[PDB]
């Protein structure tokens, strides 16, 4: 099981080997349309882009390009669409693909200012009286609600397709202390959070894919999903020693690049699904104990 190995690798000192070796064998596959000229002010980063097979497309006559993959875990029964943060100029895009890909929730992993630089676009109204128009999409975004923790908030969000007048709730997570290239302050406080959009309904078959991010869509966002559908695998058939982590890592890559940016965000995803173990094994008291441990009262 997992455990075990994941004592091999830190008494062997050899995260650094094991993540290199997850880099060598990732799938490569062609981003021909993230790489016209066309879609250069559309991508945040030069060297992060969607591949071909599995980027999302807008349904617009215009140009369908985002910067947007769909993570189709088969096995787990689970999909994810992972994009970058929004530029000044996707905000419309962004919103057009949660309502076209009928997502119920957006799971955001950065904060739009990180390291004295911006790193996504103020993409979501911050206040329930100023609403935002999306003029390019025809969309309008209202912040209905907001309930701030310590370190994660949850916003309630009105989307309202302009041009038919129809109306849908998106629930907003957002964690706000895991810094870009870092890992969450704990196992616990990663997991409450993680629970609390599994709670939400956000990640049910009956809604489209949840919408995950972070500043390019890989990192933090690939640490979330490799988490979760970990967890949901071995939750499927109660069997923790089921699950071969770098095995789903390899398989995510199919669908998106450089999912995971670092040897430790790797150990830290051992490390949540490890804990979360508990959980999907009978002990509904851990859930209480990361909520404890996460400090989430201001
Ligand atoms: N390598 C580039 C792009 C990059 C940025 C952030 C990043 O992680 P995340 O998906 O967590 O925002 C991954 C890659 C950079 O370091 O700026
Ligand atoms: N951090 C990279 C993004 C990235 C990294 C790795 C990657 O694939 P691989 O890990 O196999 O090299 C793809 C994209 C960059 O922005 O330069
Ligand atoms: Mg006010």
Same mark, same amino acid.
């Given at each position: 099981?997992?455990?075990?190995?994941?004592?091999?690798?830190? +008494?062997?000192? %050899?995260?650094?080997?094991? /993540?290199?070796?997850?880099?060598?064998?990732?799938?490569?596959?062609?981003?021909?349309?993230?790489?016209? =000229?066309?879609?250069?002010?559309?991508?945040?980063?030069?060297?992060?882009?969607?591949?071909?097979?599995?980027?999302? !497309? *807008?349904?617009?006559?215009?140009?369908?390009?985002?910067?947007?993959?769909?993570?189709?875990?088969?096995?787990?029964?689970?999909?994810?669409? *992972?994009?970058?943060?929004?530029? =000044?100029?996707?905000?419309?895009?962004?919103?057009?693909?949660?309502?076209?890909? +009928?997502?119920?929730?957006?799971?955001?992993?950065?904060?739009?200012?990180?390291?004295? #630089?911006?790193?996504?676009?103020? /993409?979501?109204?911050?206040?329930?009286?100023?609403?935002?128009?999306?003029?390019?999409?025809?969309? +309008?975004?209202?912040?209905?609600?907001?309930?701030?923790?310590?370190?994660?908030?949850?916003?309630?969000?009105?989307?309202?397709?302009?041009?038919?007048?129809?109306?849908?709730?998106? @629930?907003?997570?957002?964690?706000?202390?895991?810094?870009?290239?870092?890992?969450?302050? %704990?196992?616990?406080?990663? *997991?409450?959070?993680?629970? !609390?959009?599994?709670? %939400?309904? #956000?990640?049910?078959?009956?809604?489209?894919?949840?919408?995950?991010?972070?500043?390019?869509?890989?990192?933090? &966002?690939?640490?979330?999903?490799?988490?979760?559908?970990?967890? @949901?695998?071995?939750?499927?058939?109660?069997?923790? &020693? %089921?699950?071969?982590?770098?095995?789903?890592?390899?398989?995510?890559?199919?669908?998106?690049?450089?999912?995971?940016?670092?040897?430790?965000?790797?150990?830290?995803? /051992?490390?949540?699904?490890?804990?979360?173990? !508990?959980?999907?094994?009978?002990? &509904?008291?851990?859930?209480?104990?990361?909520?404890?441990? &996460?400090?989430?009262?201001?």
């Amino acid at each position: 099981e997992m455990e075990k190995e994941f004592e091999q690798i830190d +008494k062997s000192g %050899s995260w650094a080997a094991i /993540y290199q070796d997850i880099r060598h064998e990732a799938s490569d596959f062609p981003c021909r349309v993230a790489k016209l =000229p066309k879609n250069k002010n559309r991508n945040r980063y030069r060297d992060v882009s969607p591949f071909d097979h599995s980027r999302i !497309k *807008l349904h617009q006559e215009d140009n369908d390009y985002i910067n947007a993959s769909l993570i189709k875990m088969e096995e787990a029964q689970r999909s994810y669409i *992972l994009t970058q943060g929004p530029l =000044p100029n996707t905000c419309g895009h962004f919103w057009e693909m949660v309502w076209e890909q +009928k997502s119920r929730g957006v799971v955001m992993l950065n904060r739009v200012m990180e390291k004295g #630089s911006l790193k996504c676009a103020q /993409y979501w109204p911050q206040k329930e009286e100023k609403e935002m128009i999306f003029e390019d999409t025809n969309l +309008k975004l209202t912040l209905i609600s907001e309930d701030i923790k310590s370190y994660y908030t949850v916003r309630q969000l009105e989307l309202e397709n302009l041009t038919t007048q129809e109306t849908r709730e998106i @629930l907003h997570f957002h964690y706000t202390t895991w810094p870009d290239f870092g890992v969450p302050e %704990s196992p616990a406080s990663f *997991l409450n959070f993680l629970f !609390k959009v599994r709670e %939400s309904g #956000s990640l049910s078959p009956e809604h489209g894919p949840v919408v995950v991010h972070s500043s390019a869509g890989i990192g933090r &966002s690939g640490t979330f999903c490799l988490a979760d559908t970990c967890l @949901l695998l071995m939750d499927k058939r109660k069997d923790p &020693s %089921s699950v071969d982590i770098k095995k789903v890592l390899l398989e995510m890559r199919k669908f998106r690049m450089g999912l995971i940016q670092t040897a430790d965000q790797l150990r830290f995803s /051992y490390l949540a699904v490890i804990e979360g173990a !508990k959980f999907i094994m009978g002990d &509904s008291s851990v859930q209480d104990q990361w909520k404890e441990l &996460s400090h989430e009262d201001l």
